[PDB]
């Protein structure tokens, strides 16, 4: 299993570490994959580059 999660910028490195761990364990538990076969990576998106309903997250937050 390969898991790519797109996250908007702003999470700490320790939140990212917990996320990759929790995503990995969720996969192990849900589909019984062996933990060492699971690849999880995060792709960080600047808020100027993440659109919801046609508006950027930056514009929404402003």
């Amino acid at each position: 299993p390969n898991i790519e999660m797109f996250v908007v910028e702003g999470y700490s490195d320790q939140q990212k570490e917990a996320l990759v761990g929790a995503l990995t364990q969720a996969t192990v538990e849900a589909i019984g994959a062996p933990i060492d076969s699971v690849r999880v990576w995060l792709t960080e998106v600047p808020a100027t580059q993440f659109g919801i309903g046609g508006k950027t997250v930056a514009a929404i937050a402003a």
Partner: protein
Amino acid sequence: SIIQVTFIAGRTELQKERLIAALTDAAVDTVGIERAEVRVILKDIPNTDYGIAGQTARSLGRGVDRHGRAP
């Protein structure tokens, strides 16, 4: 935020439903993302279409093909 999963074909509908719930729970619990914002996409890759160490999964006896048939 958006979770894209690729994995060798052969998982059942219930395993896919479980994985979507568990990945969503993991994002909500770990970083507090609002549940309604979490999207999960699962893409089944036929064992003819996924390479490990230069070999296809079907050549290693793993997975099923595009019609759900084992090797």
